[PDB]
Design a protein around this ligand. Structure first.
Ligand code: MG
Ligand code: MG
Ligand code: MG
Ligand code: MG
Ligand code: MG
Ligand code: MG
Ligand code: MG
Ligand code: MG
Ligand code: MG
Ligand code: MG
Ligand code: MG
Ligand code: MG
Ligand code: MG
Ligand code: MG
Ligand code: MG
Ligand code: MG
Ligand code: MG
Ligand code: MG
Ligand code: MG
Ligand code: MG
Ligand code: MG
Ligand code: MG
Ligand code: MG
Lengths: 137, 244, 57, 178, 170
RNA sequence: UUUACUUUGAAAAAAUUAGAGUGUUCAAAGCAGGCGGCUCGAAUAUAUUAGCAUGGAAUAAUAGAAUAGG
RNA sequence: UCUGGUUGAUCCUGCCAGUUCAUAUGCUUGUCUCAAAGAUUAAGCCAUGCAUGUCUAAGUAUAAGCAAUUUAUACAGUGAAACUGCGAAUGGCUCAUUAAAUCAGUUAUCGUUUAUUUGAUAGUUCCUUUACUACAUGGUAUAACUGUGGUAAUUCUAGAGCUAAUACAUGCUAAUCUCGACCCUUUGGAAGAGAUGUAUUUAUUAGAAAUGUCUUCGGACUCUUUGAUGAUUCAUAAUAACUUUUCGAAUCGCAUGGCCUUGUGCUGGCGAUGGUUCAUUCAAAUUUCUGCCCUAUCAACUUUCGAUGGUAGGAUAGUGGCCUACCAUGGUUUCAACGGGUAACGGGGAAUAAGGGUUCGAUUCCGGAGAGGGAGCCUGAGAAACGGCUACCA
């Protein structure tokens, strides 16, 4: 968890060294809403992820999309593939088309290449990331 | 553009004003105020095109600078002041009280009211929040902030505002069976009763409305304005009663 | 239209400078102060090559 | 999860409201009754049965004069697809429940509406769907035709003066090729 | 000269985009404020709207909070000991957010002696590392403010796991 | 079960197009109010795709602790 | 597309001959209504004139201005000049660039700024030099103006002398509210125990079987005590400090009412302009999803000098490789990436057609971008402005 130069913590969550009520460090978490269940690994995990929809400072609002994971080779973010049929009216026929969406995946989620993920729109996380994994299947 | 615009082409003006396309090149651009640009009737249009008391803009300015026009009980001297839905316009010299309500066509009607009915207006609650020092307040559709509201008042409810004091006299909750007025969309101007409110979290709510003729239509919740209980509106309605 | 001939290229040399920068970066794959201051032919040589070779022969 | 358990609360709401003044009864019942009819929109068959029994119980507590208001609200909310058949099964259930409480001539006020539901569900489009081999569904409301039973209940209550209301659609149907 | 526009960058596919328009004032950046320890030098910046930002060019004092004790004292900043982003900032003693600095322990020690009457006993007990620092005369603190934005060099005294982590990193 | 597909409803500025009324002297046009309650008057429509809500039994993909074992 | 020939007479396949729009131009041209004005891919160059200024009773007049007057005693009518404020970021024109860019429909700001309009909103009593301006502080100050001047020349200006403010810079003046013993039993009195703004920055905290008894039959006896969203570290409140630190009216017109202990005493009307925060409105900036003409004789591209992502910082109004440091090696692509061409601004729209389609759309509305070509800035709420400024090229 502390594999970085700076100390990783949830901002403004204070663990008071004097009182020592509980062994576990105090952990803040929220429910993202829209009927998406906060996983228990988020509640009782130890990771720090500012872009997590359940423990970070990021809110899910806007479009809710679904896709198939096609790449998981880069850290805490994946690339999903959304496929659709585009209608050419002159020939009265369809053509297969696709688009690749890069999505931030919280370490509370475990994903392989090929599984179906539902993702929720959030604010720009990086140059190309505007979505966040909220459900895996 | 490098800043806010100040002109409005006639073809770009709201259609419900009924402006002649060949009268000029520009239309009265409403000034900033209680109501939105597309949902407001500037006083020049009301005084000249609707009431015909003024023959042109100069006469409208002459009328206004005499302090003859009051909007919700306060004298307004700006020609493009954005009067809007449920506003009370008073002309004491002619002994006229008007309320701005759309007709079935979707256009603001010339609706004359009595002084007793002119003493108040209705406001749809757009927001309820605690201000500084923990003082609750409600923001209505006309931008009025009213402090210390009844705790039962919630968003989408309608508050009856006394114009002399600007305080809440009564209120109507948003519920099934309540009488509602459509303030947007193609059903603008229709009146009916709520049958059901379809809820979509993260999206736009939909409301089903049934008119007295039993015709049913669906509208977004933003376009619905509760005006009273069925058969007992809190305001006088224009001719047609919002039918068709 | 990016590199089309212009009526007067000398009058817009600064514009021409940007285009050359855009060309090199775009075509790179194929190859592989402060103003607001207080104080401021081929056929012929081939014929000769054949000729001189023809003499040396 | 608990929607079926809360449905009888509507019956409690009707009773407490019935004790209120004559201005309040007109103010709160339409809100209660209309909300019950909306739940019939639900795609859950078990939930729809829960609404029907609650509507049946409220129908006994209320009078036959209220039946026009209940039916009219049902017609508004159920209009498309299975909903038309939902409307037919429900109205018969209310009539079946109110069999004892109903007096003679009580159904005259709602006679016109009932025959429309009856005929539309025997000779109309809804009747054809019930008789279609291609239509494969497990919804009981559609497999079962209760219009015939609704007719027997209706004719028992109708005064002989208004019995022409039942015969008139029959005559029009007989006029067209059958 | 500085702009924050995303048009000058390559597309996600790797394409080189062409210039859509000239640079706009609403997507500008400004020179960094390399705040350094010394006599207070702060200059105002006129930002979008009538709003103003404060640039701390130099600052030697700041308001630091003892969160376990729930107090804040104004203290002199000795120097920058560790910075996670760039060690050159430590070398040049540049003050920014998250820079680990050493502050005078005197006001906190005096408050502790006055409040607890010790140089009751159970509450007066504190972490061993913090007491060792007090004996040394300087306390490790983390700057929580942004000096180039607000003009302040506030912070908080390191404790617990954060203190142990930064002691390891030092 | 989900999707595709299809129905219906919102949405898709005005001008332009189709349409209704009106003796601009006719016409191209412009235009919404008349009589002293009269049940008088633009009734209006229009947009392939994408998103939103909704009814669907077929068709085409997609699923099953399906008719399993002792 | 049709018509007539090619045979002694037909069918089929061929050959021959005739069969609106755009540009350029020729001739003629009386009356009514109405209406437009591009083009050398030359977004090539421009003489001259004009196109952005603005004053109410209500910011500042001893103009050596005019006119007045009961002929003026601080001023007072009207008012050049100049200061101050606001506007000049709108409008108008053109289509060069621009090929997931602009644009169209559809989304988000729980990701930010917002002059103006509209609605709300700020008694902090006290706190030693009271050695005390609030019946009201300074030049820490100048313009116009007077006077002496430089330059061939410009909406160039120097030195000296003056004088104002809603300019600039400072700075103040016996309150309210919780409980309440004791009397008294209400229209109650109150000995006394207590409490006291905003703005900035940081840290911490909150924000979740009384089914009885009596009573006059009413009522009283104990308890409750934040709100919103699908969703938040939200709204809001509290503690401890912090600040080259703000704000909390030294402003103006009209009028002269009410109390008296008769004082130029106390109090007082209707307006204008300001001012802190919040909401609203006019906006802006980013932003989700789908949709562009020709080219495969363009098959690999991006990544050294940011390309894809992680952590932290800086910068920003704010998200974000936007930039920096350190890390990984990612990201797009035969479902056509990347590169190239475009006589490519996009759309609403226009023409043709029976329908499918094809073409045109600089051009009355919307959006974008530019002001000879690149680059950078001041002011301001708002501009990378060009009828603003500075440099370089022509
Ligand atoms: Mg413009
Ligand atoms: Mg609608
Ligand atoms: Mg929302
Ligand atoms: Mg569609
Ligand atoms: Mg004549
Ligand atoms: Mg004078
Ligand atoms: Mg004057
Ligand atoms: Mg290209
Ligand atoms: Mg796109
Ligand atoms: Mg202004
Ligand atoms: Mg205000
Ligand atoms: Mg001088
Ligand atoms: Mg960052
Ligand atoms: Mg770098
Ligand atoms: Mg074109
Ligand atoms: Mg071009
Ligand atoms: Mg065009
Ligand atoms: Mg420009
Ligand atoms: Mg030119
Ligand atoms: Mg300005
Ligand atoms: Mg410029
Ligand atoms: Mg010019
Ligand atoms: Mg200009």
């Amino acid at each position: 968890v502390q594999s970085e130069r700076a100390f990783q913590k949830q901002p403004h969550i204070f663990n008071n060294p004097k009182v020592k009520t509980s062994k576990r460090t105090k952990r803040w978490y929220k429910n993202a809403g829209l009927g998406f269940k906060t996983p228990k690994t988020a509640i009782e995990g130890s990771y720090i992820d500012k872009k997590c929809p359940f423990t970070g400072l990021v809110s899910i609002r806007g479009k809710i999309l679904t896709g198939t994971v096609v790449s998981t080779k880069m850290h805490r973010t994946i690339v999903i593939r959304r496929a659709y049929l585009h209608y050419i009216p002159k020939y009265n026929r369809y053509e297969k088309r696709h688009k690749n969406v890069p999505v931030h995946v919280s370490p509370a989620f475990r994903v392989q290449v090929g599984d179906i993920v539902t993702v929720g729109q959030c604010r720009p996380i990086s140059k190309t990331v505007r979505f966040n994994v909220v459900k895996v299947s | 553009a490098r800043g806010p615009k100040k002109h409005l082409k006639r073809l770009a003006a709201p259609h419900h004003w009924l402006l002649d396309k060949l009268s000029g090149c520009y239309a009265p651009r409403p000034s900033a105020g209680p109501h939105k640009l597309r949902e407001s009737l500037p006083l020049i249009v009301f005084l000249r095109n609707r009431l015909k008391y003024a023959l042109n803009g100069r006469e409208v300015k002459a009328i206004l600078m005499q302090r003859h026009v009051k909007v919700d009980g306060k004298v307004r001297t700006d020609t493009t002041y954005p009067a809007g839905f449920m506003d009370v316009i008073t002309l004491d010299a002619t002994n006229e009280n008007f309320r701005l309500v759309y007709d079935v066509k979707g256009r603001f009607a010339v609706h004359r009211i009595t002084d007793e009915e002119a003493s108040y207006k209705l406001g749809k609650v757009k927001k309820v929040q605690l201000g500084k020092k923990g003082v609750p307040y409600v923001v209505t559709h006309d931008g009025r902030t009213i402090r210390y509201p009844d705790p039962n008042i919630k968003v989408n409810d309608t508050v009856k505002i006394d114009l002399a004091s600007g305080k809440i006299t009564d209120f109507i909750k948003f519920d099934a069976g309540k009488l509602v007025y459509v303030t947007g969309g193609r059903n603008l101007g229709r009146i009916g009763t709520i049958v059901h409110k379809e809820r979509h979290d993260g999206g736009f709510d939909l409301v089903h409305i049934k008119d007295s003729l039993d015709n049913t239509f669906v509208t977004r919740l933003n376009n619905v304005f509760v005006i009273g209980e069925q058969g007992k509106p809190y305001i006088s309605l224009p001719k047609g009663k919002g039918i068709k | 239209g990016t590199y089309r001939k212009r009526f007067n290229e000398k009058a817009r040399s600064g514009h021409m400078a940007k285009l050359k920068e855009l060309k090199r970066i775009r075509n790179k794959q194929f190859t592989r102060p402060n103003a607001n201051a207080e104080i401021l032919s081929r056929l012929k040589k081939k014929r000769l090559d054949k000729f001189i070779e023809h003499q040396l022969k | 999860e608990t929607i079926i358990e809360r449905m009888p609360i509507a019956e409690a709401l009707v009773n407490i409201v019935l004790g209120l003044t004559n201005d309040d009864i007109t103010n709160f019942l339409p809100s209660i009754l209309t909300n019950i009819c909306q739940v019939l929109r639900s795609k859950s068959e078990e939930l729809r049965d829960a609404v029907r029994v609650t509507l049946g119980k409220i129908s006994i507590i209320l009078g036959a004069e209220y039946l026009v208001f209940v039916i009219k609200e049902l017609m508004a909310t159920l209009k498309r697809g299975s909903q038309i058949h939902v409307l037919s099964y429900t109205v018969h259930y209310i009539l079946k429940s109110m069999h004892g409480v109903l007096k003679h001539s009580d159904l005259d006020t709602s006679s016109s509406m009932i025959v429309k539901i009856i005929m539309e569900n025997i000779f109309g489009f809804a009747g054809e769907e019930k008789d279609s081999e291609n239509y494969h569904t497990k919804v009981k409301e559609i497999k079962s035709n209760k219009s015939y039973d609704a007719g027997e209940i209706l004719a028992s209550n109708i005064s002989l003066t208004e019995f022409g209301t039942l015969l008139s659609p029959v005559k029009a149907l007989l006029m067209v090729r059958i | 000269g500085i702009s924050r526009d995303s048009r000058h960058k390559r597309s996600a596919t790797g394409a080189k985009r062409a210039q859509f328009r000239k640079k706009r004032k609403f997507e500008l950046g400004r020179q960094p404020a390399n705040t350094k320890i010394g006599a207070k030098r702060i200059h105002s910046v006129r930002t979008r709207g009538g709003n103003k930002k404060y640039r701390a060019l130099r600052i030697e004092t700041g308001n630091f909070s003892w969160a376990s004790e729930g107090i804040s004292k104004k203290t002199r900043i000795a120097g920058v000991v560790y910075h996670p982003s760039n060690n050159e900032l430590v070398r040049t003693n540049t003050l920014t957010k998250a820079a680990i600095v050493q502050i005078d322990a005197t006001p906190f020690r005096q408050w502790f002696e006055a409040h607890y009457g010790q140089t009751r006993a159970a509450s007066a007990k504190i972490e061993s590392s913090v007491e060792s620092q007090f004996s040394a005369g300087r306390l490790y603190a983390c700057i929580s403010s942004r000096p180039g934005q607000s003009g302040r060099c506030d912070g908080y005294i390191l404790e617990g796991e954060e203190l142990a982590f930064y002691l390891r990193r030092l």
